[PDB]
Amino acid sequence: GSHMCDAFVGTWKLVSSENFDDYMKEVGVGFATRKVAGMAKPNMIISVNGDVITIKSESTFKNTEISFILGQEFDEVTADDRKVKSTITLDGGVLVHVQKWDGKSTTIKRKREDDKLVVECVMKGVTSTRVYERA
Ligand SMILES: Cc1cc(S(=O)(=O)Nc2ccnn2C)c(C)cc1Cl
């Protein structure tokens, strides 16, 4: 029957980005990776099978894929090649994705707003907002 993340499931395309270069700088991404990653217009493909959620992020820069159970830490290699320990939870209908590495932390929130999927990436005081629409 109907379930936890139904409104997230599907194929989404990036339509706007703000402050992503600054977010990446704060994370520690180097110049060349920032330039090429920042150009990209990824799709995000979200699916659910039982308790397992899969998020694929695909662009001309990189294809990534994570599968996880809410609340259960996992290893992730990010598109910029960080090796992080991640935990994703649902907080009042928002997917909250925390990545920990080298004593640092970043949080990515994904939420449904109208017909969009809005992604907010936060590293210390710097936020990037990335808006997706259905493909
Ligand atoms: C590097 C990077 C990538 C992302 S992403 O948007 O999920 N994926 C992305 C960007 C460009 N191509 N692809 C697949 C995010 C949220 C953060 C960071 Cl630092």
From Swiss-Prot:
InterPro entries: Calycin, Fatty_acid-bd, ILBP, Lipocln_cytosolic_FA-bd_dom. This is Fatty acid-binding protein, adipocyte. Its main location: cytoplasm. The modification Phosphoserine is found at residue 16. One of its GO terms (molecular function) is hormone receptor binding. A fatty acid binds at residues 130-132. GO terms for cellular component: cytoplasm; cytosol; extracellular exosome; lipid droplet; nucleus. Forms a beta-barrel structure that accommodates hydrophobic ligands in its interior. It is found in: Cytoplasm; Nucleus. GO terms for biological process: brown fat cell differentiation; cellular response to lithium ion; cellular response to tumor necrosis factor; cholesterol homeostasis; fatty acid transport; long-chain fatty acid transport; negative regulation of DNA-templated transcription; positive regulation of cold-induced thermogenesis. The modification N-acetylcysteine is found at residue 5. A motif (Nuclear localization signal) lies at residues 25-35.
